[PDB]
Every structure is written in structure tokens, then in C-alpha cells.
Design a protein around this nucleic acid. Structure first.
Ligand SMILES: [Mg+2]
Ligand SMILES: [Mg+2]
Lengths: 141, 142, 161, 154, 114, 160, 165, 51, 116
RNA sequence: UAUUAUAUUUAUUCAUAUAAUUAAUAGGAUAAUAUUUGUAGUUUUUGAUACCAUGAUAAGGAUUAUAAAUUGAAAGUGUUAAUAUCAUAAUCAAAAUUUAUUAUUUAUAUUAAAUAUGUAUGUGUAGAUAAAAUAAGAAAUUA
């Protein structure tokens, strides 16, 4: 326990600098916000890779049978309306009921960050190639 | 404390890096209060319900002479932009003014429009030792 | 409002440096490490990665084994029998004077990494293909086991007189 | 297999040193035995292991027998020889378990944890959905979605 | 009594009705209050003497229909369904000259397009 | 007497995927719910995290809600029945009594004098025996009557 | 299932009988009870920890309700909540104070009844005695600090301070 | 909509694109127009408020 | 436009899990079958006991209110919009004794003390 | 020399304080009578303060061992009692990182009530360091 040294005085013309810096940090933040809203909505609106992990069942099965039949003829329209976002996709599968208890229990789904890739994604590197200038919390393309 | 930045520098001990129970730290220092989120824009560091009324602090409650700064939990309202009146807030070193009015501010609290910890640093509020330690962390050039 | 052409004080400040390295204190290089597997030695990578055999797998195994028995597929049983015969032979009692090396004292302090780093690097170098204390080969006589396919029960019709 | 992520490999001897806690935990050893038995193969090394370890456990609170000093050091060397024998009897087992488990997983259309060999199927370590975008040890780029070891029908 | 028990729920135990009167700062006022609630609760329970309409219902756990009953679910409308399934077989035989896979939605299932 | 895990593991040095050990918020715990609790990556302490996700009391509370859901769910899958509210007259002789509310008296035996001792609470009635009572309007019985097994009949198990 | 909750009025039954919901409204009038209209039917969750004899923590009553979001903020919480009046907070407010005896009686009162006079605090007495001791040897390391300065600056007509050496 | 429930129901019609300035190549927002000067509204306060 | 954004306007009387809007034939397999699958099906609904059937039980609900029953399927719980506890947690009685570690006690009565 | 074993296992990116006046007593219904309802005499002192101003409790394993038995110590770590003779600096919210002395959540599902953290994917990878023989499971190189 030593007596606390006194803090030096503030600065000369640092009040102006702090005002200006915060001022235009805010002005910048307006466009950063505008842009990230644009990005967020563009992502919600655009298609995604299929959410289910095909390495497990009932998904591994050849695309001409089983769950894929159930999807092509009964669920297709809906699955496309929600753009294969993993949350509504999993919910639709619960509500189709012809799988029923399996969706959470036997079936496996891709992890969050992989399931969020844009449809067409070929290489894994894509997760890291999305824009970092934008504040969407990984909800941006 | 080592350096006294206020009176309390004399009264308080740091106790090293000490753990406090969850969400009670004696001093409320909201470093995160401006922390950009597009999707969470209306739920983060704002009212939990959009049907809540604006706080006390958006209203003139009593007979006033006038104020120096308005509180930082005051929420920015279309009139803040339009009326063209002084809107000040107490930040450090002194005060932050909203000078350049934008509708993009509207509906958020000024907590959220004022960056608490600036990327800007005064070299003149720093000891030569402290300046050294800020060069080590790769903040100040030298 | 109206995003300005220039920012006076905004980009003015000193840029934070990129980190040069990873892991503890951001000082670790990217290089090959002890944890790295070798896929060129035997059926198991070495050192072997953790593996969890589950009752689930045991049931799937049972059903596979059954379905295989009923389709009269004897081949995978034979590969499995072979594998087992090769690697399950009884290891030979070591000669006196033969022991695994310990890590020399008075080299590093007892809490130091070097200790583990030695152990790993030793066991990494002795792969099961280097275990000479277990007798595998064509040369090996195997009293406990059947030699080939022709001696197992699904061949029984040829065993008949 | 549910546990898919990249992992840290421990040297065989430290795994064995866990004794009753893991390596010889009864529960675990029994389902190893189940795997072997179901494949129609004697579990001799498991039984050797179980014998050694059973007895380890029984006397685990006793003090070791009193040592008389010898210039020969025959006693010390015989204790050592016995000890490394047992160590090797158990290495063999540990190997068997990793071996057969990988093989059986190959038959069950199971995908192993990241960076793991399955002899007929994935020669270099199998990987999909790692935290790191390349295969860790090849230093080659990983495809999206996760690579498939098995043909599609189930 | 049944009505008394259902009205005062956890306030009965071991066949003793027990009201804890906490409302006022002084014990006197709490015996006033407590006594009042008691007579008000008796007044309402006593309605069971006005006729059956006030006798509280019994709650039975009634099973779903049994396996034996459920078996008939597969014979419901048996005639109509066989007679119909022959026509559907014609529809199927015909549809299967055109396309490789015939969905129930080409046969008896209705799905509204727009 | 369940073997399942009801307690969230205590925070410690980082666990890694090993023989004998898995990460704390690994996808295999609590049926993959741990997603809700997870901060992925090499988290930079100073700048990043979500505090509640490392807090013992908060985390454990969440886990406890999840366990409660599991139990509730299984108790409801366990029901084959509905509660119907039937007027006192029409109900079977065993319910013509007074039936104390739950946790009010001693767990109660249905009919000690007739040698049935079981919770009246958990006694379930067949929809077919209550038919006349529950669907009086219908005329002809909607459910066909249960067929019962003669326990005096000579059948395969009596060795004839 | 998602269903409409339903109620059969006793006049419509082929035996009149008192419907459990009706009874519930009776019970709500008697002990005046807030009926939460938005209470989700799906959310019945007992608190396993305290309500099952299987856990060492078993109190027999639902200690907490298991609702994640629930907060001191909500009107529902406010309506069933214990006010701080006459709780331990009040007890602290009154009995825990710097000189505990000032809780039992006015110091001046006590002093004047017991001793003939008001007595200074021990600390004050210390500074007093010390001044007397050290005024006896050195003089003029001192200062003159009062509450009200006029009495020294214009002293009364008399008052000729004795010269000192 | 926040991401938890209805995120996929967001429309491009929500974006106030006329408010900002975009770069053709990137598809990104470069600048924001000023909001306040030209801003007309018949409702500074809600319609039912007469002061 | 508030009903268009389901997760945005949560009054502080509102409770999870949200209830889905009702659907006409859904209450049992016979009704459903009659309305959607096979439309000449003679039995329009499975026999309805003339007395009241309480579907949530023991819980009493307001009659005429569209409601949900505790979910049997694990997935139904997991994929619904039920939130996790995030801030500090509150109890209407226990808040007066601050935290578990500050356990405020007005009087030192035996914890087993019994009100007469 | 007898009264009996360190060479095992697991770890290491560690940050948080602010907007000046400490000096005294005073009782009420169901009491045998008090307007004491409404009790009114400025002004001679000086230390715990932002400041020199003694005392006192921490942490820190190294040889009194097994039986009916504890693996935490006195040698002193801000706040405490005789040295005074620059100054009101104290939280009742919503706040400004440089400080040796700190175990964070690492890939199926991820922001609902007090407002609550945007950042560092990089071959489990330098140097150097941390902890443990106690309801657990470790066994042989004293002064
Ligand atoms: Mg001291
Ligand atoms: Mg003060």
C-alpha cells in the first residue's frame, strides 16, 4: 500500500480531439450500420447449403429414396421458400411428421458456422472469406 | 490504487485481479455499450420491450434553470435531430456533443452513440513508463 | 450526417499490429508438432487418436454380423480372423537389462514440458510395426489359433469323411 | 460415431497408467470384450490385461515387499523385467482395441473423429468439418461439404 | 365436504382446514380477517346442499381406446375402400405408363396448387 | 433411479478431446443443447465473450430447466388417458367417496376391504366400460365390448 | 396437441354437475387470485431438484419456478413480492450505526443525567489534552481556526489578551 | 426480424436503399445521405397527441 | 405492422413457448383423415364424450383459449423458441435475502421452527 | 542397516473504480387536569485531512508416522491507541484499460426482462513456467 501518485493533467486541445474523434466515429458507424443491415437482410433473403449432415442417416440414403423422396414430392416448395436456412428447415421437418421423432435424435445436422455457407459453396475456406467489415455476427455472406 | 484518477484512488484497493459475483462489479463501466450489431440493433443494450415508455431522463421533471449535460441513458428522439438544440453527454475527458444530427441515431440510448474507450490516446496523460507499456502492446508508435 | 469526404481524427491513429503467431501469448509458430499422426505405419495411425466404442455401435455390429451370416458371406470374417491372428500373439518375456528409458533428472525442472515431450517422442518412434517383442510374421507358429479359412466351421462339409 | 472433432493423442503408457480409472474401468473393458466376442474372435489379450489389472487393484493399498540390498541388483532387474513384460502385454491390447475399433467402424459406415485412419477407406487421416479449413497434417485444402467414405444407400 | 376441499386446495391437510391470516400488521385484525375468509369459504362450499348442479365433478382417468378397439380402425369403411382401391389401381396402372414413379398425389391425395 | 447426468461439469483448465475427456460444451452433452452455452474458438478474454456462458450458477440453472423438460416430456408420453369430469352418480363404486387433493393426505388405497390396495390417483378406467356413461346419445355402442380371457379354460398353457 | 380448451355448461349435460373450472372461479373470488391469461399450457415444469426425493436437495416445495426470462422488472413479479418494510433491512437501518449507544439514547441526555455534564468523545478529549501539554512548552507552531471568525476579528470592547513571552 | 425465429422472413423491401449510396462493383454501402434536412413527416408525435 | 414480426414485439406479459394458430381438423386422426386424406370417410371425428375432457391436466386453463399440451417429442422442445437464462436470476421472496452467499436473516430462529 | 516409494499425471493468450460542508437533548388515547399547543441566550479556537503524524491479526510444505488422532506455521500483509500545525476531495447508480500475483465457453441445434462485451480459424505447435501423493486407484537411488 503506497500513496497513489497524482495523475498528470489532461492535455491541451485534447478536448477538441476527443470531440472530433467520437463525432466521426459515430458518423462512420452510421454507414457501418447501414451496410451491415444490408448484409444481414441480403443473407436472410439468399439461399444456403443444405443444413443436414449427409454422412449419417436418414440422409446418406441415395437421393432417389427415403427422406429425399419425402422432400422432393411433399416438402420441396416449403424448403425453397425458407432458403434452406437451418432453423426453419429443421422446423419444417418436425412439422412434416412423416419422419417424426427422428429429426433431433437419429439425424445429424451440420454445425452452425458450416450450415450458414451460401449455396454453391465448394471449399471449406469459404467460412473465412466472408466480409469482416460488417457487423452481422456471422449472419452475413 | 496505484494512480489516483479521482478521489477514490486514495480510498480503494485493487486486490489484484479479483473475481466478483456474476454481474456485480462494484463500478459500472460499460465498455461494451457501443458494440455494433445489425441483427440485434433493437435488442442490444436497449429496452427489453418496445412497449416500455422512455426513461425518466427524457423529460423535464421539475422547475429547472437548465442542465449542463443530459444523462447517457436518455434516448435519442426525432426532436434531438430536428430541433437543433444543444445535446451534450458526459464522457471523458469532458463532454461529447451531438452536433451532426442523423436519423440513424433515433430510438437508441446515447450510451450506444458514445464510444467509451476511444482508439485515440493522449500521450500527455501518460507517464513515460505508461507510454512504454502502450508501445509494448502495439498501440502507440515508437 | 451525410458521410464526409475526409475523416480528420478517425484514421489518424496508429494501426494495431497483426499477430505474428498462435497459441499461448500469440508467440507459437505453425510447424509440425508431436500431436501429428503418421499414416505410413501399420493400420492404425500413430499415435492413435482417441476412439469411443459405444453400445450403439455394438448393436449395429450385431446386426451386420447377422445379416452377413445369413447371406453366407464368409470373407470379412476371414479378414477379421486374420488381423486378430496376426496381432494377438503372446508377447515374449524381455531379457534382463531391457527396460523403457526414463527421462534424465537434473536436465530440466520437474514441472517442465520436456518431460512429456520425451515420452511422446519415444512412443512415436516405436510404432507397433517396430515392436519386436511381439512375434508376428509368416515364420511364427501359432498353437492357439486356426491357420486358414479351410479350418473354420463354415467349411465343415470338406471336413466330413 | 458422435465425437467428430480433432483430438489430442496420448502416449500408450500414460493411457495405461490410468489403471482402474479408465484403461481398466470394468465398464469399458466389458464392451471391448463385447466387440471381440461378437466378431467371433477370442479375446486373449483383453483377458491377460484384465488379469494383471484385477490383481493390481486388489493389492493397490499394500506396501511393497521389504528390499534387502544387493551388489548383483538381480532383484531390481527381475522386478523391472516383469514390469516391462506387463507393460507390453498391455500395449498389445491397447493396439488391438484401436485396431479393431477402426476396422469395425469401417464396416458400420461410421465416420471417425477428425484426423483418423481407417485402413481400407481413409488412408491419410479422415477429416470433415474441422475448425481449421485445411487437412491438418497433409496441409491440403478441405472440400465442402464433408468428404464421404461410403456409397450412398443405407 | 368435497366442495370445501376443492375450493380450499392446499389449505386442507390431514382432514384439517387451516387458514393462515397474515394480511394485517396486528394479530387482532388477522383473527377478524381469518374468521371472515372462513365463513365466506363455508358459505360457498355449502352450495352443495342446493342441488346436484353444485356437487363437484369426479375426475376419472379414462384410458384411450384399447388395442382391441383400435384394431377396428383398419376396417372402418371396408367396402367403400376396397371398391375404391380397384378404381385407384386402374388410375395407377394408367399413370405408370407415362412416368417412372407414381405418387399418391397423382392418385387419391389432394394438394391444392394455388 | 436414473443414470443420466443432471449436473453441468465445473469450469477448469480447458478440457480437450482426448481418450477419457471431452470439451466442456461439446455437442454430445445434454443432447446437443450445449449449443446454447457455447462461445466458440480461442476466445480473447479482454475484448470478447458472453459472461453468462461461463457462469456456474446461471449455466447450471439452464441445464436444470432442460432436465425438467426431459422429465415432463417423458411423463406425458407415459399417459394413455385423459381426465374426464364425470358427475358423481355415474361413477364406479370406488370413486363414490371423498378423494383428498394431491399431497393433502396420505397416499390413498382404492379399496382395502375388497383386497385392492393401489393409488386411487393412478387408477385408470377403460373407455369401453364407461361407454354407456360417456356417450349416452349414440344408441348403439360405438366401441365394441372388451373380450376377456377365461382363466378356467383349458388352453395351451394348462398343458391341454 | 394444439386444441381449444373447452367447457360444458352443466345445464347441457345429461346430469347436472359442477364443472371444475367453475369451482376454480369460485376459488379465485374467495382468495383473490390473479388468473394469468397468457400462461402457456405446455410449460408445466416441476422443479426437479427440490421436488424429487432423489436429490439431496429436497425440500418438498417448488423453491424456484423454472422460467428462464423471469425478472424483477415484470408486473407479475411485482404483484407477488415481499416489500422491504419491516424486514431485516429496517433492522439494519436502525441498529447498525457508528456509535452503538446512540441507538439507545441521546448522548447529551445520558451524560447530563449520569455525569453532571456533556462529555466530549474520547478522540476529542485526546486532542484537547495534547494541546494542553504541548502548549505548555512550545508556543506558536499553532493556528487560529474557528467556525465563525467575527468573534476574533472584532472582539468585544473589553478583551485585552494578556501579552505572552 | 432477429435471427432466432423469423429471420428467413426478412424482405429486401425493408432496406431503405434510397437513403444510402452503394458501390457498383462490391455491392457495398459506401456513404449515407443526410437524413434530417429533407425529412417530411405528418407525425412528429403520434396522431392522437395535441399539445 | 407488428404481427408480421413475431419475435420483435414482446410485451412484458407475454410468455414462451408461443402458441401456434389453430388448425381445423387436427384434434384426432379420424377428423384429420376425414378432412384432408380421404374425404368420403364416414366418421367425421372420434367419439366425443359428452362430459368435459381436460387435456392439460392437472393444469386448469381458461375455456375457449387456444392452447398447447406439454410436448412428448424431444425435438419439439429443442427446436421451439424457448430462451436460456442470461441475466442474473430473481425470485420474488428470495430476493430479500440477497444472494445465496449473503443470506440475510432478520432473526436467528431455528430453520426448523414451526409456526403455531 | 532395521521403524519401507519424487520421476508419475494434468496444466500456462488474464483486462476492469466515481460529480466536496462529520458538532445537542426534547416523552401524546383507555394516566386525578403543566399550551412544557409551538421547550428560540450567534460569535476563542487549531491533527487522522488531499498531509508528516509509533504499536496490532496475512501469506509462505521439508523429518514427534498410525492409534481410540487434522496436510497449514509467530516473527507480520492498506484501514486499529500519546510525534500533529498546506488544503471540505468518498459510492445513493448507469462512469476513463498498464496493472507482477489471473484456471474462460474450441464446431449437430447459439441474445426474452436491471444493460451485460466484435473478437485471435491457423500442424495441441518457441523460450520459460503452474499444480497434486488427503475417497481414492502412482511404488524403490536419505541426512
Ligand atoms: Mg503492520
Ligand atoms: Mg460527503
Amino acid at each position: 500500500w503506497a500513496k497513489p501518485k497524482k495523475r498528470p493533467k489532461v492535455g491541451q486541445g485534447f478536448h477538441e480531439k476527443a470531440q472530433k474523434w467520437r463525432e466521426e466515429y459515430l458518423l462512420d458507424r452510421h454507414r457501418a450500420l447501414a451496410d451491415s443491415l444490408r448484409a444481414y437482410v441480403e443473407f436472410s433473403t439468399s439461399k444456403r447449403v443444405e443444413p443436414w449432415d449427409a454422412r449419417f442417416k436418414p440422409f446418406d440414403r441415395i437421393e432417389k429414396d427415403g427422406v429425399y423422396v419425402l422432400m422432393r414430392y411433399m416438402m420441396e416448395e416449403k424448403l425453397q421458400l425458407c432458403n434452406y436456412h437451418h432453423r426453419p428447415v429443421k422446423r419444417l421437418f418436425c412439422n412434416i411428421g412423416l419422419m417424426g421423432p427422428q429429426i433431433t435424435t437419429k439425424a445429424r445436422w451440420k454445425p452452425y458456422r458450416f450450415a450458414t455457407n451460401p449455396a454453391g459453396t465448394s471449399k471449406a475456406e469459404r467460412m473465412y472469406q466472408r466480409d469482416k467489415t460488417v457487423y452481422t455476427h456471422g449472419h452475413n455472406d | 490504487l496505484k494512480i489516483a484518477k479521482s478521489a477514490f484512488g486514495f480510498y480503494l484497493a485493487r486486490r489484484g485481479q479479483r473475481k466478483y459475483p456474476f454481474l456485480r462489479r462494484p463500478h459500472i463501466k460499460n465498455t461494451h455499450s457501443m458494440n455494433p450489431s445489425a441483427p440485434y440493433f433493437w435488442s442490444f443494450m436497449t429496452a427489453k420491450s418496445q412497449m416500455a415508455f422512455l426513461p425518466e431522463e427524457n423529460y423535464i421533471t421539475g422547475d429547472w434553470t437548465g442542465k449542463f449535460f443530459v444523462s447517457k441513458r436518455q434516448v435519442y428522439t426525432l426532436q434531438h435531430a430536428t430541433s437543433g438544440a444543444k445535446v451534450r453527454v458526459k464522457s471523458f475527458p469532458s463532454i461529447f456533443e451531438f452536433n451532426s444530427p442523423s436519423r440513424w441515431n433515433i430510438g437508441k440510448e446515447m450510451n450506444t452513440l458514445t464510444k467509451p474507450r476511444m482508439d485515440l490516446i493522449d500521450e500527455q496523460m501518460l507517464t513515460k513508463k505508461q507510454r512504454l507499456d502502450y508501445v509494448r502492446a502495439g498501440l502507440l508508435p515508437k | 450526417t451525410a458521410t464526409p469526404e475526409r475523416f480528420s481524427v478517425l484514421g489518424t491513429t496508429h494501426p494495431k499490429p497483426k499477430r505474428t503467431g498462435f497459441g499461448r501469448n500469440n508467440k507459437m509458430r505453425s510447424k509440425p508438432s508431436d500431436n501429428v499422426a503418421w499414416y505410413d505405419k501399420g493400420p492404425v495411425e500413430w499415435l492413435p487418436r482417441p476412439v469411443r466404442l459405444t453400445y450403439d455401435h455394438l448393436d449395429q455390429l450385431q446386426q451386420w454380423t447377422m445379416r452377413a451370416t445369413l447371406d453366407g458371406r464368409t470373407e470379412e470374417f476371414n479378414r477379421i480372423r486374420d488381423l486378430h491372428r496376426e496381432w494377438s500373439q503372446h508377447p515374449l518375456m524381455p531379457v534382463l537389462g531391457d527396460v523403457e528409458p526414463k527421462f534424465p533428472l537434473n536436465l530440466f525442472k520437474q514441472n517442465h514440458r520436456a518431460k512429456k515431450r520425451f515420452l511422446v517422442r519415444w512412443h512415436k518412434a516405436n510404432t507397433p510395426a517396430n515392436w519386436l517383442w511381439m512375434p508376428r510374421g509368416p515364420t511364427v507358429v501359432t498353437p492357439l489359433h486356426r491357420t486358414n479359412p479351410t479350418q473354420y466351421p463354415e467349411n465343415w462339409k470338406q471336413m466330413v469323411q | 460415431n458422435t465425437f467428430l472433432t480433432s483430438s489430442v493423442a496420448t502416449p500408450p503408457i500414460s493411457v495405461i497408467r490410468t489403471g482402474p480409472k479408465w484403461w481398466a474401468d470394468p465398464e469399458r473393458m466389458v464392451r471391448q470384450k463385447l466387440m471381440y466376442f461378437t466378431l467371433g474372435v477370442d479375446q486373449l489379450p483383453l483377458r491377460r490385461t484384465a488379469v494383471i489389472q484385477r490383481d493390481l487393484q486388489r493389492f493397490h493399498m499394500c506396501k511393497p515387499p521389504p528390499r534387502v540390498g544387493d551388489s548383483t541388483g538381480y532383484k531390481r532387474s527381475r522386478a523391472a523385467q516383469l514390469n516391462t513384460w506387463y507393460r507390453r502385454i498391455q500395449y498389445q491390447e491397447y493396439h488391438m482395441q484401436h485396431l479393431f475399433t477402426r476396422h469395425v467402424w469401417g464396416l458400420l459406415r461410421v465416420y471417425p473423429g477428425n484426423t483418423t485412419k481407417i485402413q481400407g477407406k481413409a488412408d491419410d487421416g479422415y477429416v470433415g468439418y474441422d475448425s481449421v479449413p485445411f487437412h491438418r497434417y497433409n496441409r491440403a485444402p478441405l472440400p465442402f461439404p464433408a468428404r464421404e467414405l461410403y456409397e450412398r444407400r443405407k | 365436504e368435497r366442495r370445501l376441499r376443492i375450493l380450499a386446495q392446499h389449505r386442507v391437510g390431514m382432514g384439517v382446514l387451516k387458514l393462515d391470516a397474515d394480511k394485517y400488521e396486528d394479530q387482532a385484525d388477522n383473527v377478524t380477517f381469518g374468521t371472515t375468509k372462513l365463513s365466506e369459504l363455508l358459505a360457498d362450499a355449502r352450495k352443495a346442499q342446493l342441488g346436484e348442479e353444485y356437487w363437484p365433478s369426479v375426475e376419472l382417468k379414462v384410458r384411450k381406446p384399447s388395442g382391441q378397439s383400435k384394431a377396428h380402425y383398419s376396417l372402418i369403411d371396408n367396402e367403400r375402400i376396397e371398391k375404391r382401391s380397384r378404381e385407384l389401381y386402374e388410375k395407377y396402372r394408367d399413370a405408370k405408363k407415362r412416368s417412372l414413379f407414381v405418387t399418391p398425389m397423382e392418385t387419391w391425395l389432394e394438394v391444392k396448387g394455388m | 433411479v436414473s443414470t443420466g447426468e443432471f449436473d453441468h461439469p465445473p469450469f477448469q483448465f480447458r478440457q480437450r478431446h482426448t481418450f477419457n475427456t471431452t470439451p466442456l460444451h461439446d455437442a454430445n452433452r445434454f443432447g446437443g443443447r450445449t449449443a446454447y452455452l457455447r462461445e466458440i474458438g480461442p476466445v480473447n478474454i479482454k475484448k470478447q465473450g458472453r459472461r453468462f456462458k461461463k457462469d456456474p450458477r446461471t449455466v447450471q440453472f439452464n441445464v436444470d430447466v432442460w432436465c425438467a423438460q426431459q422429465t415432463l416430456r417423458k411423463r406425458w408420453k407415459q399417459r394413455d388417458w385423459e381426465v374426464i369430469e364425470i358427475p358423481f352418480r355415474l361413477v364406479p363404486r370406488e370413486q363414490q367417496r371423498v378423494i383428498p387433493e394431491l399431497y393433502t393426505d396420505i397416499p390413498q388405497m382404492t379399496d382395502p376391504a375388497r383386497n385392492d390396495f393401489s393409488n386411487i390417483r393412478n387408477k385408470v378406467y377403460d373407455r369401453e366400460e364407461l361407454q354407456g356413461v360417456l356417450f349416452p346419445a349414440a344408441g348403439a355402442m360405438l366401441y365394441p365390448p372388451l373380450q376377456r380371457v377365461d382363466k378356467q379354460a383349458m388352453t395351451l398353457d394348462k398343458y391341454l | 396437441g394444439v386444441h381449444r380448451v373447452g367447457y360444458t355448461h352443466p345445464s347441457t349435460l345429461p346430469v347436472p354437475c359442477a364443472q371444475r373450472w367453475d369451482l376454480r372461479l369460485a376459488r379465485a373470488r374467495i382468495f383473490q387470485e390473479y388468473i394469468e391469461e397468457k400462461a402457456p399450457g405446455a410449460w408445466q415444469l416441476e422443479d426437479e431438484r427440490s421436488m424429487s426425493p432423489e436429490f439431496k436437495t429436497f425440500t418438498g416445495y417448488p423453491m424456484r419456478d423454472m422460467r428462464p426470462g423471469y425478472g424483477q422488472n415484470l408486473p407479475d413479479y411485482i404483484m407477488k413480492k415481499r416489500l422491504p418494510n419491516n424486514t431485516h433491512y429496517e433492522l439494519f437501518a436502525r441498529r447498525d450505526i457508528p456509535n452503538e449507544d446512540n441507538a439507545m439514547y441521546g448522548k447529551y441526555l445520558y451524560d447530563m443525567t449520569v455525569h453532571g455534564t456533556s462529555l466530549p468523545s474520547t478522540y476529542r478529549m485526546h486532542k484537547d489534552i495534547n494541546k494542553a501539554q504541548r502548549n505548555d512548552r512550545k508556543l506558536s507552531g499553532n493556528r487560529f481556526k474557528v467556525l465563525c471568525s467575527s468573534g476574533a476579528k472584532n472582539p468585544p470592547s473589553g478583551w485585552e489578551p494578556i501579552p505572552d513571552a | 426480424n432477429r435471427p432466432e425465429v423469423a429471420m428467413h422472413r426478412n424482405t429486401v423491401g425493408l432496406l431503405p436503399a434510397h437513403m444510402w449510396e452503394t458501390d457498383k462493383k462490391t455491392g457495398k454501402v459506401k456513404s449515407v445521405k443526410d437524413s434530417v434536412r429533407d425529412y417530411q413527416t405528418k407525425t412528429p408525435y403520434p396522431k392522437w397527441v395535441q399539445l | 405492422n407488428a404481427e408480421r414480426f413475431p419475435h420483435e414485439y414482446h410485451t412484458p406479459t407475454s410468455r414462451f413457448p408461443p402458441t401456434p394458430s389453430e388448425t381445423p381438423a387436427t384434434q384426432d386422426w379420424m377428423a384429420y383423415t376425414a378432412k384432408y386424406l380421404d374425404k368420403q370417410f364416414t366418421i367425421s371425428a372420434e367419439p366425443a364424450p359428452v362430459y368435459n375432457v381436460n387435456k392439460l391436466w392437472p393444469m386448469q386453463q381458461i375455456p375457449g383459449k387456444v392452447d398447447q399440451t406439454p410436448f412428448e417429442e424431444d425435438q419439439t422442445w429443442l427446436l421451439h423458441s424457448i430462451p436460456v437464462q442470461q441475466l442474473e436470476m430473481h425470485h420474488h421472496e428470495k430476493d430479500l435475502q440477497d444472494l445465496p452467499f449473503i443470506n440475510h436473516e432478520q432473526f436467528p430462529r431455528s430453520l426448523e421452527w414451526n409456526a403455531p
